[PDB]
Design a protein that fits this description.
Keywords (chains A, B): ATP-binding, Cell membrane, Disulfide bond, Glycoprotein, Lipid transport, Membrane, Mitochondrion, Nucleotide-binding, Phosphoprotein, Translocase, Transmembrane, Transmembrane helix, Transport
EC number (chains A, B): 7.6.2.2
Structural class of chain A: alpha/beta
Organism (chains A, B): Homo sapiens (Human)
CATH architecture of the largest domain in chain A: 3-Layer(aba) Sandwich
Bound molecules: tariquidar, adenosine-5'-triphosphate, cholesterol
Strand order of the largest sheet of chain A: 4-9-8-7
Oligomer: homodimer
GO molecular function, one term (chains A, B): riboflavin transmembrane transporter activity
Subcellular location (chains A, B): Cell membrane; Apical cell membrane; Mitochondrion membrane
Shape of chain A: elongated
């Protein structure tokens, strides 16, 4: 089997969370234990290479050789809080893990067989076709979600398996079942390493090695059955009916003292034996397209499975379209035509911009999962980015524009030509994409959403002021005019105006015989446009669209760089 | 001491969470134990009268007499999740509790002495002058927050003290310290009643009575020390090094069975003895002004202590004011004057309306605390409502209007008279108050905020469309025009227009010699107003303000009725 032998570890983050730690984790159900403040999860990550190598200051050595570069890929790790996708079926999650982790050369049949074997081992065949739990509804119980995570890691038939708090939040019976399962797995020769919180003695009866850590020091390392003898030799005695694990924790808590216990251990025989043994010992798979395909499939399944956001979006869009069609129904080429036309176009543009502050949740929600799967070697960050965009951002931002136009354009009696119709659709879509892209660039690489939302709203108000309606941009001062070139709504609104007002007459019965509209009348659309600053040449419309495209590219690239320079360790 | 003797309890919510429960809770450290699904907190609330009496179907009797009407006031209850105010100092929270609970007749000196005694008993004198923990920063540790809650309840020197999960989320040492404190309190003759989750044997060694509940049935009731003997007599045996509490939970879990255990208990000697004993036994302070003063003081201290919301509000308001002053600087009486003036007024109005969707959090956040203190008899709901409004809603909604006007009115070159200036200020304030009041009426009596926020935004968009700028209300159809009378921004915007445009000329160099402005020019403000539907008489402005006031009153009354008919039990 595998023999993971740490030695003289010291990790500096210059607070030193772990001071001096040596041991050997032979095959079996090895364990790590101690108070919450003690560096147990930290040590676990150190052994699994999930922590920045800079602070590390010791020699980790497996089976007599230094850790291979591909270690994380050939050794599983199970996070504390399950990251499985509730909106998917158990077998679907295992299938995703199998498809990306296992080699491409293998056939789909072999991978399906392996998945069946794993489900059989973990006893999940009952729920192999059930939802894993949206947490709005729970297709499976907590224990089965945990077993599913363990299965995802087990797909590649790992030799070394790390776990963090495998029994936390579970009921006593569920925890016992999980740990008995781990004991069965270890009997096969698989080295299991894990951390726990105040285990029961039925659980503690099953261990093969113990590692007790407090304030970053090694109180004990050796066979669990003999830990009680060691402490009793130290003088501390355990009354019956008291769980020995709690007894160790009491001894640590003093119910300073901790350094005294460390000194005792260094004087111990176990330490000498372990040190002698240590000195004796010292003596991507897949292509880009495949990753993109699979992550996009998973994202779309989640998108469908969670109907709240999508369905609410479509319904609100339709209702707004119908209401606006009723209110602005039958626009007239009279004194009030200009007001209503500009108003509706402004409203549509702002609705597209302000309805995209819900894109912050795209990457904020799935930060932990992305980090875990990137470290574990599932996929690159490029494939995650493009697949997630192509599955979530593209369709649900393209739809509202189509709904709005199809509903309003004919109820409102806007221009009857088709070239104008599709320009309206394209312009609204580009506004939505650019706004959502900006939201991504602002929200990417963040775990808190509120700050991002506030920032987006503030930015959008300051953009809205510089839209043509409220301010008459020709009037703004020169030292402030240049900010108008940073506004998405300005480009969209200007394009829509240039599409609609051109070739419209708003002075009925002028008769042009006196030929005097007083020069204060705004009797034509061209005149209104030039008075608002717009350009009547065909270049104006297309330059607005061009600017929107450039903003899209800029913001998406920023988001990618923010993900690629995120702290993943 | 006190002797709380329940008997033949049965509670129906017609799922019957509690089936049949009898016992006697003599003075000391009585306890309630069992699985999470078991009705332990439910039984606790039943005994403390925190549950609707309708479902209850048994006789609760204290010291031989039925529960007095003023029981909740003379018996403390400690909620699971601490409700203390982080933004206050420990002694301040205890002072608030002392001021409202203790009688008015007492002097302040006596109440201060009592507070000092309580702090001395609980050993909080060290942190008597420290912040209780915003959870952005923690002035005190979790154990001290818990001790503070217990002190708030202890102020009135209660005879009967109920607790719920006093050790959940605490560390082992902290939990032991808390329970040892409770043991010290009980040694003085105070009946303590509480519920716990998987206690340690060091804790379990301290009890005086035990009540084991599973699936709403009484597995055991008697001395804790003898529970192990009872179960061993039943046949189930406990291996050493196993916590007896976990042993009982295992027996319940089967590691149906539960009904079998209930049958055993009914056959037991303890049940017969308890039944015989039971049959033998059966054989506002303060004035309104005081409550208002104290709750308002606490609310203002919290408002100051948490600077995020307030300071961000002021800063954003100032920045917007300066930006708008720069952009619209020097309004001119030319063709573009009308556009810019209407735009800025519309923007200010909408900013006041849309910045008030942050008032939903006023009562949403503090629902649990309000319910707890109302049941416990601290204050009426009227005083809470008025004090909370008078402390939070009034000043922070009045300030932005003043900032906006003082900043913009002179940079923009609006009307130079003062009567107009103060009308602008008053109108903006009333808009803010009415909008916040509507948000309260929508959010009061809710624990989820997101739905309220979405509703508020939707309402405000539909209000905005019917503002005069985008739609030319004179044009809307008759069967839809009547909705314009439900819009706050319409009233505010109309009032501002009527204040500004009156007596303004927007056609420079007309010379009035030809006297022909083409009738399409809008050469005067009065003409613009009449074309938009407004009335030039003085009544229009004041009727808009009147409507806003009526909306304020309506919505506030609705909020009060929603709080007064909330489910507090
Ligand atoms: C610290 O400082 C501040 C903090 C906060 C606020 C204000 C502050 O300081 C002031 C107010 N927060 C409100 C959060 C929020 C989010 C989304 C919306 N929903 C739309 O905004 C909208 C949606 C449309 O369709 C869905 C639409 O279609 C036409 C037009 C829309 N909005 C406008 O037109 C408009 C105009 N002015 C505004 C001024 C301030 C805030 C929002 C404004 C919105 C509204 C409010 C919360 C925190
Ligand atoms: N990246 C980091 N930066 C600063 N301090 C850290 C970092 N990682 C760990 N620490 C410190 O190391 C100590 C050990 O924390 P540890 O990881 O053991 O938490 P834990 O509660 O034991 O984990 P678990 O959630 O499994 O119980 C903590 O006091 C923590 O402040
Ligand atoms: N108001 C209510 N309406 C419907 N069911 C209720 C209500 N109150 C309690 N119950 C039911 O009673 C059962 C007992 O819940 P209980 O109050 O014991 O929760 P608990 O987890 O034991 O409390 P704690 O948070 O202290 O652990 C639950 O199954 C719950 O569904
Ligand atoms: C880092 C962030 C702010 C990106 C900001 C990029 C903005 C300011 C840039 C991106 C592309 C740019 C546009 C590219 C093309 C043209 C056509 C030209 O004849 C007028 C300016 C105009 C319309 C530019 C305005 C400024 C612009 C929109
Ligand atoms: C229950 C909720 C919706 C409260 C809604 C109340 C609204 C619709 C009511 C409250 C007071 C009312 C106003 C009372 C007085 C006047 C003066 C009158 O010459 C024109 C109508 C006008 C301006 C009313 C319009 C409708 C109004 C604003």
């Amino acid at each position: 089997g595998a023999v993971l032998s740490f030695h003289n570890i010291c990790y500096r983050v210059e607070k030193e969370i772990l001071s001096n730690i040596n041991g050997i984790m032979k095959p079996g159900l090895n364990a790590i234990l101690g108070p919450t403040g003690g560096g147990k999860s930290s040590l676990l990550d150190v052994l699994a290479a999930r922590k920045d190598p800079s602070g590390l200051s010791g020699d980790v050595l497996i089976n007599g050789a230094p850790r291979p570069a591909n270690f994380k890929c050939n050794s599983g790790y199970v996070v504390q809080d399950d990251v499985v996708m509730g909106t998917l079926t158990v077998r679907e999650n295992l299938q995703f893990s199998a498809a990306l982790r296992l080699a491409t050369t293998m056939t789909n049949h072999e991978k399906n067989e392996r998945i069946n074997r794993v489900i059989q081992e973990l006893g999940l065949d009952k729920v192999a076709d059930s939802k894993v739990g949206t947490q709005f509804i729970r297709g499976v119980s907590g224990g089965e979600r945990k077993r599913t995570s363990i299965g995802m890691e087990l797909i590649t038939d790992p030799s070394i398996l790390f776990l963090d708090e495998p029994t936390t939040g579970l009921d006593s019976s569920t925890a016992n079942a999980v740990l008995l399962l781990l004991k069965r797995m270890s009997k096969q020769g698989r080295t299991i390493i894990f951390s726990i919180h105040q285990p029961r003695y039925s659980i503690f009866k099953l261990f093969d090695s113990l590692t007790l850590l407090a304030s970053g020091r090694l109180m004990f390392h050796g066979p669990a059955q003999e830990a009680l003898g060691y402490f009793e030799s130290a003088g501390y005695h355990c009354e019956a009916y008291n769980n020995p694990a709690d007894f160790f924790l009491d001894i640590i808590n003093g119910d300073p003292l901790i350094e005294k216990l460390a000194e005792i251990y260094v004087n111990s025989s176990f330490y000498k034996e372990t040190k002698a043994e240590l000195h004796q010992l010292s003596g991507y798979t897949t292509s880009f397209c495949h990753q993109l395909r699979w992550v996009s499939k998973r994202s779309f399944k989640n998108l469908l499975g969670n109907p709240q956001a999508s369905i609410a979006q479509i319904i609100v869009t339709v209702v707004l379209g119908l209401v606006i069609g009723a209110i602005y129904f039958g626009l007239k080429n009279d004194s009030t035509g200009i007001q209503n036309r500009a108003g509706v176009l402004f409203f549509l543009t702002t609705n597209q911009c302000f309805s995209s502050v819900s894109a912050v949740e795209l990457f904020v929600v799935e930060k932990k999962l992305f980090i875990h799967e990137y470290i574990s070697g599932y996929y690159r960050v490029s494939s995650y980015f493009l697949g997630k965009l192509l599955s979530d951002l593209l369709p649900m931002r393209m739809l509202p524009s189509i709904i709005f136009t199809c509903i309003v354009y004919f109820m409102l009696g806007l221009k009857p030509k088709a070239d104008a119709f599709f320009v309206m659709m394209f312009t609204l879509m580009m506004v939505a994409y650019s706004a959502s892209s900006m939201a991504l660039a602002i929200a990417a690489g963040q775990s808190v959403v509120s700050v991002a939302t506030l920032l987006m709203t503030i930015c959008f108000v300051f953009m809205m002021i510089f839209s043509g309606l409220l301010v008459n941009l020709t009037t703004i001062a020169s030292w402030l005019s240049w900010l108008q070139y940073f506004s998405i709504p300005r480009y969209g609104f200007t394009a829509l105006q240039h599409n609609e007002f051109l070739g419209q007459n708003f002075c009925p019965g002028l008769n042009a015989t006196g030929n005097n509209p007083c020069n204060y009348a705004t009797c034509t659309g061209e005149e209104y446009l030039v008075k608002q600053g717009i350009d009547l040449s065909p270049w104006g419309l297309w330059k607005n669209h061009v600017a929107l495209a450039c903003m899209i590219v800029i913001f998406l690239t920023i988001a990618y760089l923010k993900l690629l320079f995120l702290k993943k360790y």
